[PDB]
Design a protein around this ligand. Structure first.
Ligand SMILES: Cc1cc2nc3c(=O)[nH]c(=O)nc-3n(C[C@H](O)[C@H](O)[C@H](O)COP(=O)(O)OP(=O)(O)OC[C@H]3O[C@@H](n4cnc5c(N)ncnc54)[C@H](O)[C@@H]3O)c2cc1C
Ligand SMILES: Cc1cc2nc3c(=O)[nH]c(=O)nc-3n(C[C@H](O)[C@H](O)[C@H](O)COP(=O)(O)OP(=O)(O)OC[C@H]3O[C@@H](n4cnc5c(N)ncnc54)[C@H](O)[C@@H]3O)c2cc1C
Ligand SMILES: NC(=O)c1ccc[n+]([C@@H]2O[C@H](COP(=O)([O-])OP(=O)(O)OC[C@H]3O[C@@H](n4cnc5c(N)ncnc54)[C@H](OP(=O)(O)O)[C@@H]3O)[C@@H](O)[C@H]2O)c1
Ligand SMILES: NC(=O)c1ccc[n+]([C@@H]2O[C@H](COP(=O)([O-])OP(=O)(O)OC[C@H]3O[C@@H](n4cnc5c(N)ncnc54)[C@H](OP(=O)(O)O)[C@@H]3O)[C@@H](O)[C@H]2O)c1
Ligand SMILES: O=S(=O)(O)CCS
Ligand SMILES: O=S(=O)(O)CCS
Lengths: 522, 522
């Protein structure tokens, strides 16, 4: 029933095995009790949820010298990230990128013939299921042994009041509560949505007991929809995306968005805009057999036995909002001020629970800032001007303004991009670097080597936006964004030391134009 | 003989084709003459060589409003980079990484059975030869049409004196000369070094007319040797590296270097330290049949019909020094002051010609600084504290101080790395991100997911060094290094916005420890 793990010190691999056993427990498994029974201090904060926001907030609070407690219904820390969100998404995207390369060079060099080859979606999901306890293990281990945190896992938390939480049969008090229970997968209110064969990111890694047929229907047009859709397409299946409005509106630069969309279509993906599913058809056995949708051109029917819903995420605020009387936003997000404080005294909310942006940097930092405030360090947090990214069969990175956006916003600008604007268009051997060299050199594949661009204010000479499609630039955007927030100019970018051949050619391309007082686009 | 191209406007692809024809022409091909015969201004500088240093120096000088002329014996601009250096090297490294991936997951999912599979080296070299004109075409096009450069290609320059140069049968005067002829491949002074089957980066892409046997011997232990050696090994050939002293001394962090070397040996590479080739054995046909070398454990003979020399490059200074009277350094490098000025009046030297470090940033920047000085802007260039990288089957990036180096420097330090130092060792699902997810999740492949670390001063809290083995961090090191030179602390690093899952986990890991006054390693 209840396991006092406090004085047990499992290694990373032992935790992995223990977590698996607890997950495959018919009765649900024993509660993991990791509380220090010597500490006389009252918890400065109890975190409802031990995902990215809860675990990081706890790590920072503890590091500051305060006391904290995490209560999570899962037998592992880390939350959705390692179980059904970021981690599997990246494994699937890695597969999508490698498969695109394999299909492109099928039967050439060492690449086998991919012609009639269909990779199994379940096959790959099963790979993730078989190894996700690795990350689970690291989380419990690092949190307990390295970050000195206290926690109770595999036990839903019962919030009594703004200072009281019930867990593992016990009752705990705390000066503050930090709500970090995240969000749940959006869905549709159409007939058949509950049919077997309908999945979302969460159920996909829990209930896929068959290998999908040749046609897959994805509903949605943003990150999740595109990331998973490209993976499904990559396995060799006809992938049809049903987008309510238009896809990838997140990509503000028009040329960048068009490149990403064109490359998706070139891989065989079908994207139908202005479409709404009206019915998911069931066969005699209650399994999906087709999807019916209304489009600008009328109703359409797509035969499929596998539907993936990539809609938004809805903050799990209902219960907590009822018990505490928290003020909520129009999408159900818990409202909070710049210090992450809710409408209820001593109650904070962080991560996905407070709405967009739903990213790991937001979850972790909000968690930490809430902790710092709980510890007396009054610090505000209002996420703005952050870099962003998503996967198709490529890595797509972006920060700041798109080109048209900047011109419309009154900025006189010049752009520096690759490939250049010429009659040969994308059919040239640049941009190019790690993981795009085969495309750059292959027969008829040069247009696949990538696309990138920086938008610059002609007068201040400052970089207003950066955009990249290819591989190996995502990490750089984290640091480039800080430099840009500090006031980076084309001259300063040009005076840096590049590491050729570089995923982003921004440094040397800037240098080619920085010598003039009057900037010219490249 | 001389094609006046000034008023012709070939596209990138037409340039690619034209250059191909000139390179294959039995008579040597026409001279490409792109000079503005109506511009009466004197040349501020004539660049001898139009590779990285000469082309960027020219672009910057023209951008500043000056007049320049490039003379290059190759029919294209860009120099060794696109023809036989950086570019092919990256195509080979891309293959090496994909091949290690395919061999690791041999016969799994979409991966073909690699067991008895030997990839053709000539096949890949041939792929490079067939597509290198793409990059050549862009160089000629961009230079002429976007950068407004004047140039004469496919013509060796004949320097008359410090103000006079003959090209295309014409004599040109200039206020200055900027020498940018680069360096030639290093060789060994041993018997048989001229036997067929012995190559260096340059001859490999011009003279490989056979497919190498099952064993390859590489001589050298730094960047070139290791990059090409891993590629050869990845094709499925037994690869022995003969290192005069120690391999990869450039990787100062012992722990980082060890991981890299261990992964190489795991791939089957044999790295022999303190070894010197004494003789290269030829068979009766004049082809290498074996290599004999002295080692710490005596003499050894390796049978092979393919030897690759990855020694250093040797500045092409002889002729120019005899004509102009240039002071040379011990390795034949042209000596220059911090303004890139040689001992000769109005003569500058840049790029590989002035010695190490021989990198593209150094070549391009020295060319631009020399150009600025020629234009009246007194500015010094002294390369120091720059990021660096190299390829094995992984991308290896480093900057600043290694852990041991920081301590010997008198710094009290802590480090944050992945994976953590536990008894499970590297056999854990971290670090992980794009292109390392399969290793992170594969059966028994977790130790291959990478290694990374930042070195921090325990008192000042400043990051003194960063090291990474995996994929996708190289571009990031370009920007991160700038931040580090600015005085980056673990607190500032921790307050950035990460894009999870990130090649470098530095941001969030720093955040996990930044909450404490007294830092503790992770
Ligand atoms: C498919 C997908 C892919 C994504 N990929 C990325 C990506 O690549 N990069 C990125 O930056 N972001 C990505 N995100 C977004 C990111 O996953 C989230 O923003 C982040 O996980 C939110 O963390 P959190 O701590 O707020 O919530 P969560 O991780 O959702 O965790 C909430 C935690 O609280 C627990 N909990 C809930 N209710 C209770 C209760 N009553 N009692 C006890 N415990 C409870 C849960 O079990 C869970 O552990 C992705 C999201 C999805 C859906
Ligand atoms: C195998 C290899 C891999 C490398 N990989 C990288 C890498 O990944 N990243 C990096 O940053 N650096 C890399 N480098 C180093 C980089 O290639 C060089 O530092 C850089 O190319 C030097 O540029 P440069 O302009 O000084 O010389 P070069 O590029 O060598 O060009 C000199 C030019 O002068 C011309 N020339 C010579 N003699 C005459 C003459 N008499 N008349 C007219 N023209 C003449 C040549 O034809 C040529 O175009 C690599 C080097 C090698 C050998
Ligand atoms: N960094 C990453 O890699 C990553 C990956 C996945 C998710 N995330 C984050 O996780 C959150 C949720 O992901 P998300 O992809 O769903 O993003 P989102 O930006 O919330 O987009 C929701 C998508 O679902 C569609 N949608 C919502 N309700 C619908 C309905 N009733 N019918 C039809 N379509 C509907 C929307 O279409 P319209 O816009 O056309 O209405 C839109 O394409 C986001 O904040 C996101 O940024 C990040
Ligand atoms: N960024 C990149 O990817 C990249 C790739 C290739 C080259 N480069 C640059 O190009 C330049 C030359 O490349 P490099 O790889 O040769 O680097 P380098 O650092 O100059 O190393 C020279 C290597 O050649 C060996 N060597 C030299 N003379 C030798 C001799 N007589 N006998 C046996 N071994 C001998 C050295 O051995 P010992 O040191 O053990 O004596 C050493 O391993 C460098 O400045 C380099 O950084 C950069
Ligand atoms: O952000 S956390 O480290 O808690 C989970 C990463 S998978
Ligand atoms: O540095 S140059 O742009 O001249 C050649 C790059 S391959």
């Amino acid at each position: 029933k209840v396991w006092n793990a406090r004085n047990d010190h499992l290694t990373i691999n032992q935790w992995a095995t223990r977590i698996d056993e607890i997950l495959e427990a018919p009765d649900g498994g024993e509660v993991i009790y990791n509380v220090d029974e010597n500490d006389p201090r009252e918890y400065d904060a109890i975190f409802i949820g031990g995902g990215a926001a809860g675990r990081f907030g706890s790590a920072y609070l503890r590091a500051m010298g305060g006391r904290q407690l995490i209560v999570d219904r899962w037998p592992f820390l880390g939350g959705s990230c390692p179980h059904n969100a970021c981690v599997p998404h990246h494994l699937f995207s890695d597969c999508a990128a490698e498969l695109m390369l394999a299909r492109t060079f099928s039967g050439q060099y060492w690449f086998p013939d991919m012609t009639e080859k269909v990779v199994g979606i379940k096959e790959v999901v099963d790979l993730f299921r078989a190894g996700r306890n690795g990350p689970h293990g690291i989380m419990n281990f690092q949190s307990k042994e390295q970050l000195n945190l206290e926690y109770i896992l595999n036990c839903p938390a019962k919030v009594i009041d703004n200072h009281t939480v019930e867990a593992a049969g016990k009752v705990f008090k705390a000066k503050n509560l930090i709500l970090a229970v995240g969000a749940g997968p959006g869905t549709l209110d159409v007939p058949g949505v509950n049919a077997k064969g309908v999945f979302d990111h969460a159920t996909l890694v829990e209930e896929l007991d068959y290998e999908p047929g040749s046609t897959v229907v994805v509903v949605g047009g943003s990150k999740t929809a595109v990331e998973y859709g490209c993976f499904f397409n990559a396995t060799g299946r006809r992938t049809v995306m049903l987008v309510r409005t238009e896809p990838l509106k997140l990509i503000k630069d028009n040329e960048t968005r068009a490149y990403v969309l064109d490359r998706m279509k070139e891989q065989g993906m079908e994207i139908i805009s202005g479409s709404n599913v009206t019915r998911i058809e069931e066969d005699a056995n209650g399994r999906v057999q087709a999807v019916v949708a209304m489009t600008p051109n009328g109703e359409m029917r797509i035969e499929t036995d596998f539907v993936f819903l990539g809609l938004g995420e809805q903050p799990r605020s209902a219960e907590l909002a009822k018990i505490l009387g928290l003020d909520l936003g129009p999408k159900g997000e818990v409202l909070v001020n710049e210090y992450l404080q809710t409408s209820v005294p001593n109650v904070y909310a962080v991560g996905d629970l407070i709405g967009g942006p739903m990213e790991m940097f937001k979850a972790r930092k909000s968690g930490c800032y809430a902790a710092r405030n709980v510890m007396g360090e009054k610090i505000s947090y209002t996420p703005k001007n952050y870099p962003d990214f998503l996967h198709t069969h490529y890595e797509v990175s972006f920060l700041g303004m798109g080109e048209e956006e900047a011109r419309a916003a009154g900025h006189e600008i010049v752009t520096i991009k690759m490939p250049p604007d010429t009659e040969n268009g994308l059919n040239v051997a640049l941009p190019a670097s790690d993981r795009t060299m085969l495309y750059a050199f292959g027969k008829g594949t040069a247009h696949m080597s990538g696309f990138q661009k920086i938008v610059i204010d002609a007068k201040t000479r400052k970089v207003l936006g950066a955009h990249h499609v290819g591989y190996g630039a995502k990490d750089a955007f984290q640091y480039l964004n800080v430099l840009i927030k500090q006031g980076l100019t084309v001259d300063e970018l040009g005076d840096m030391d590049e590491l050729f051949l570089n995923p982003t050619h921004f440094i040397q391309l800037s240098r080619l134009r920085a010598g003039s007082k009057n900037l010219v686009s490249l």
